Design an enzyme around this catalytic site. Structure first.
Site, PDB file in Angstrom:
ATOM      1  N   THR A 159       1.193  -1.212  -0.278  1.00 33.55           N
ATOM      2  CA  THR A 159       0.186   0.017  -0.345  1.00 33.55           C
ATOM      3  C   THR A 159       0.601   1.227   0.039  1.00 33.55           C
ATOM      4  OG1 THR A 159      -2.049  -0.942   1.006  1.00 33.55           O
ATOM      5  CG2 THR A 159      -1.560   1.464   1.401  1.00 33.55           C
ATOM      6  N   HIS A 420      -1.267  -9.286  -1.004  1.00 38.32           N
ATOM      7  CA  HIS A 420      -0.602  -9.086  -1.425  1.00 38.32           C
ATOM      8  C   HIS A 420       0.914  -7.865  -1.430  1.00 38.32           C
ATOM      9  CE1 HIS A 420      -1.125  -4.043   0.265  1.00 38.32           C
ATOM     10  NE2 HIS A 420      -2.678  -5.221   1.016  1.00 38.32           N
TER      11      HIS A 420
HETATM   12 ZN   LIG Z   1      -3.756  -4.820   2.191  1.00 38.16          ZN
END
Ligand SMILES: [Zn+2]
Ligand SMILES: *[C@@H]1O[C@H](CO)[C@@H](O[C@@H]2O[C@H](CO)[C@@H](O[C@@H]3O[C@H](CO[C@H]4O[C@H](CO)[C@@H](O)[C@H](O[C@H]5O[C@H](CO)[C@@H](O)[C@H](O)[C@@H]5O[C@H]5O[C@H](CO)[C@@H](O)[C@H](O)[C@@H]5O)[C@@H]4O)[C@@H](O)[C@H](O[C@H]4O[C@H](CO)[C@@H](O)[C@H](O)[C@@H]4O[C@H]4O[C@H](CO)[C@@H](O)[C@H](O)[C@@H]4O)[C@@H]3O)[C@H](O)[C@H]2NC(C)=O)[C@H](O)[C@H]1NC(C)=O
Ligand SMILES: CC(=O)N1CCC(C2=NNC(=O)[C@H]2/N=N/c2ccc(Cl)cc2)CC1
Ligand SMILES: CC(=O)N1CCC(C2=NNC(=O)[C@H]2/N=N/c2ccc(Cl)cc2)CC1
Ligand SMILES: [Ca+2]
Ligand SMILES: [Cl-]
Ligand code: NA
Ligand code: NA
Length: 805
Positions: A159, A420
């Protein structure tokens, strides 16, 4: 300390930030514990919700309501977003047919169309298709505006690295945010998601868009919403700012959603629980667009809908544990998860050994779900090495898996079903891009592109000059109805020499031998024409590359190939040749096995020599134009020129010979001819940029022959494959790679097998953009084509990924 005794009356969501111990009324204060006593009361109203209903229409303004349905609200700029729909019979923006926005249709006072960045965390690319039935607002933006089928995030596909890349146009190695968790040695400090250290400015490099805007006199809304401010309030705040007077109104805005990422971690990317957060994001888009239509700004504002990364299925039972590979697992610190980064637990220990750690992690289990690398050996396309915050030992983790140190780290930290952070080529990590507005094109699909390119476009959209960044400015011009940036080709810095025959055989003492003393006026004129560049239009399809730094080099012509030969590095910088579909592969005749021939156009003092290779027990050699692809037995002698030779580890020759003997011909057959440009790369300090001479750390023993860290090839053909590579009328098609020049094949676990089982897989992993090769070589390719320069720039940023559909 903050003397939080002051008030926020009339100051709600003020744009400039006051410095402590004065109390703050900006949307960041919550995160710093410095909001005035009355912030929530005045600035975070919620009474009666977010929507108008019939019986609220024409009401007496009650200032306690979250938003208003009173008569004066339009000009007060604070109606609920659905006001005109409920109280004036107007339609929702999503219900209107879409009509091309040929020019900005803005209120008087607007000096430029505003930009609104709508960023969504964990919004995987395939949500656009798979969730289309529940996202009608987003679907209208997508089909009526400009969209890509997906956008490539940067590595790691976390992120913070990706949001900050969106804002700066920089690789995480350059902006400094190299992960969601970091340790810096020079600071001596750590950086985490949980905590206050992340708020220190020393971590954040480059120049983000909001600072670029402010420095050039364009005003910005905030790009940082506190987690507790609800989405409806973020939207209403943007809409209020848009009603400010001309001299106070920002030109650029950002909205951010923590969804669908938050839910995706809990339920997996396509968990049934995911439909709801997608409905909710769409509702918020609806609110913004209804709000803009209300202010008559819906054909004025440019809107960017953009995600940071996707989401993959990952559960606790898919965890590899380092305690199953190492014995000294307590002498290390791991940054764990969807990537691994390893360092010594203690800096006082000189008994710590990275080479032994790596060796202990290499091909140890048949099914192993990660691969260790020294950071400088990571595929160059990841651009993930040039930062002190990136540990020397890295683990690339397979999609769908985690790495952890010991089992205790997992059950005493299954929680999650999604995660992720994997390699940025992985389909599940891809994210979204939509642009809608007067400056974007109407109903247009563009090819997938990388998120590093967006900063330049956002700057163009606001008439700003971008700070220096990793985008290639102009490569995204095809997204825009009107461009303020017209890119030009960089000027060539060094012009080549064109040497003729200048040296007699006997002047050379290179220790090379060849069985070539085998003896016609017809074909004596022929070979002369070849050495003067008669066949050059065949093998040099796009002009010669331009050399963009100061150096000494020669253009050398041959029947089958042309090269740019560096007198400084004693080898070609580039070798260009075309292999048509019909061309044939022959073998190297027995008598020419160890043949190396002096080049009579090039002085002994600027040539390599065979003796060095004989003395160097680790180093062998290869050729840039492959002897296997010679057009005639006579032309084959050209391929054994000392000026075509480059240093190669025997382990690397296995890879290189297979590419040259088998793969080039296969590509020519499949693509209807290919043009190939190959050469060496020197990147000893792993900064992604061409090394100068004084940076080379390795030479062929007892010589000034520098050893390349990598070898590249650029393989071009016609996008319309019904046309041969050498007679292409239109757009081109390219794939390229940058292979690491390594003394072992430890990277490939199946390398004891035939090259047909592993070599191509290695090459795929090291796929690259032409642009990556440009940075690494100081060369500029495709100087002479029929194509427009913006199209060539798009071609140079293309990456062939080798992922399914
Ligand atoms: Zn995340
Ligand atoms: C992607 O795009 C980016 C941006 O365009 C490219 O990165 C640029 O590359 C340039 C060349 O490498 C580099 O230019 C150098 O700048 C040095 C000072 O720069 C500072 O100021 C700038 C501008 O405001 C700032 O951006 C820099 O910020 C870095 O450092 C801070 C704090 O440390 C970080 O917070 C920030 O994240 C950033 O870190 C990144 O960059 C540094 C390198 O600068 C890396 O080490 C980090 O890991 C991280 O990636 C700086 O604060 C300047 O001093 C250099 O000049 C030397 O070399 C020239 C050669 O021409 C010589 O003439 C000079 O005299 C000088 O030599 C002297 O210093 C040597 C080293 O100390 C010494 O050995 C000599 O003896 C001499 O005394 C140089 O000009 C530019 O800074 C970065 N920009 C960024 C943002 O990273 C990147 O290349 C692109 N990537 C690809 C693949 O294309
Ligand atoms: C003087 C200085 O340097 N700064 C910049 C940083 C702060 C901010 N300025 N504008 C913002 O929105 C806020 N940070 N936003 C961010 C949004 C996304 C991400 Cl990943 C990181 C930060 C305070 C001022
Ligand atoms: C603790 C920290 O610093 N981060 C900041 C980043 C996240 C954000 N929190 N709030 C935001 O608005 C959001 N940044 N949003 C952005 C808007 C536009 C752009 Cl181009 C990039 C980012 C998580 C927290
Ligand atoms: Ca370098
Ligand atoms: Cl991380
Ligand atoms: Na040798
Ligand atoms: Na191996």
């Amino acid at each position: 300390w903050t003397a939080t005794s002051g008030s926020c009356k009339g100051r709600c969501f003020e744009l400039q930030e006051v410095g402590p111990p004065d109390c703050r009324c900006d949307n960041l204060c919550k995160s710093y514990s410095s909001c005035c006593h009355d912030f929530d009361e005045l600035c975070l109203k919620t009474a009666r919700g977010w929507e108008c209903t019939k019986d609220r229409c024409g009401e007496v303004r009650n200032e306690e309501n979250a938003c208003h349905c009173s008569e004066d609200c339009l000009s007060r700029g604070d109606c609920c977003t659905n006001y005109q729909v409920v109280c004036k019979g107007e339609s929702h923006w999503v219900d209107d047919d879409c009509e091309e926005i040929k020019v900005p249709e803005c209120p008087a006072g607007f000096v430029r169309p505003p930009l609104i960045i709508f960023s969504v965390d964990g919004f995987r690319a395939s949500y656009m298709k798979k969730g289309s039935k529940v996202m009608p607002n987003i679907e209208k933006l997508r089909s009526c505006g400009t969209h890509a089928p997906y956008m490539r995030p940067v590595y790691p596909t976390k992120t913070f690295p990706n949001l900050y890349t969106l804002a700066t146009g920089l690789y995480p190695e350059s902006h400094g945010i190299v992960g969601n968790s970091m340790y810096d040695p020079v600071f001596d400090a750590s950086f985490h998601l949980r905590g206050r250290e992340k708020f220190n400015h020393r971590w954040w490099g480059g120049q983000p868009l909001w600072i670029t805007a402010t420095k050039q006199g364009v005003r910005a809304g905030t790009f940082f919403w506190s987690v507790s401010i609800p989405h409806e309030r973020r939207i209403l705040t943007i809409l209020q700012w848009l009603s400010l007077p001309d001299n106070e109104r920002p030109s650029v805005y950002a909205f951010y959603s923590e969804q669908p990422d938050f839910s995706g971690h809990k339920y997996g990317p396509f968990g049934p629980e995911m439909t709801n957060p997608l409905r909710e994001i769409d509702k918020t888009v609806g609110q913004l667009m209804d709000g803009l239509k209300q202010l008559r700004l819906h054909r004025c504002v440019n809107v960017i809908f953009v995600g940071d990364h996707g989401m993959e299925d990952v559960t606790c039972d898919r965890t590899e544990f380092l305690s199953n590979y190492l014995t000294n697992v307590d002498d290390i610190t791991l940054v764990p998860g969807t990537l691994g980064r390893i360092r010594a637990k203690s800096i006082n220990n000189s008994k710590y050994d990275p080479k032994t750690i790596i060796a202990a992690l290499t091909c140890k289990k048949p099914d192993q779900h990660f691969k260790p690398y020294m950071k400088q050996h990571l595929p160059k396309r990841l651009h993930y090495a040039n930062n002190r915050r990136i540990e020397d030992i890295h683990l690339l983790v397979d999609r769908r898996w985690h790495v952890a140190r010991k089992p205790l780290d997992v059950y005493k930290k299954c929680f999650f079903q999604g995660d992720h952070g994997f390699d940025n080529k992985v389909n599940s990590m891809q994210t979204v891009f939509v642009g809608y507005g007067p400056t974007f094109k109407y109903r247009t699909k563009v090819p997938p592109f990388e998120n590093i390119e967006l900063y330049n476009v956002m700057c163009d959209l606001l008439g700003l000059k971008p700070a220096p960044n990793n985008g290639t400015h102009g490569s995204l011009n095809h997204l825009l109805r009107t461009n303020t940036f017209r890119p030009t080709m960089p000027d060539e810095v060094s012009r080549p020499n064109y040497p003729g025959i200048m040296y007699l055989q006997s002047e050379f003492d290179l220790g090379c031998t060849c069985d070539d003393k085998v003896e016609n006026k017809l074909e004596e004129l022929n070979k002369r024409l070849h050495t003067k560049g008669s066949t050059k239009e065949r093998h040099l399809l796009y002009g010669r590359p331009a050399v963009l730094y100061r150096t000494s080099y020669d253009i050398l012509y041959h029947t089958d190939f042309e090269s740019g030969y560096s007198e400084i590095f004693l080898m070609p910088l580039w070798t260009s040749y075309t292999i048509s579909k019909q061309a044939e592969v022959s073998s190297i005749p027995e008598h020419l096995t160890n043949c190396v021939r002096p080049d009579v156009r090039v002085s002994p003092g600027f040539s390599q020599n065979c003796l060095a290779y004989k003395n160097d027990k680790q180093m062998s050699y290869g050729f840039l134009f492959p002897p296997y692809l010679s057009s005639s037995p006579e032309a084959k002698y050209d391929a054994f020129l000392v000026t075509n030779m480059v240093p190669m580890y025997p382990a690397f020759k296995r890879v290189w010979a297979y590419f040259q003997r088998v793969l080039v011909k296969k590509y020519a057959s499949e693509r209807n001819g290919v043009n190939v440009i190959s050469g060496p790369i020197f990147d000893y300090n792993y900064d992604g940029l061409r090394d100068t001479e004084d940076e080379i750390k390795q030479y062929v023993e007892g010589s000034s022959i520098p050893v390349p860290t990598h070898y590249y090839s650029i393989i071009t053909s016609c996008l319309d494959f019904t046309q041969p590579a050498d007679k292409c009328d239109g757009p081109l098609s390219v794939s390229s790679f940058i292979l690491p020049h390594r003394p072992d094949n430890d990277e490939s676990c199946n390398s004891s097998e035939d090259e047909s089982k592993w070599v191509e897989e290695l090459m795929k992993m090291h796929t690259a953009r032409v642009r990556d090769i440009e940075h690494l070589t100081g060369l500029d390719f495709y100087r002479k084509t029929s194509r427009s320069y913006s199209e060539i720039l798009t071609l140079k940023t293309y990456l062939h990924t080798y992922e399914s559909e």
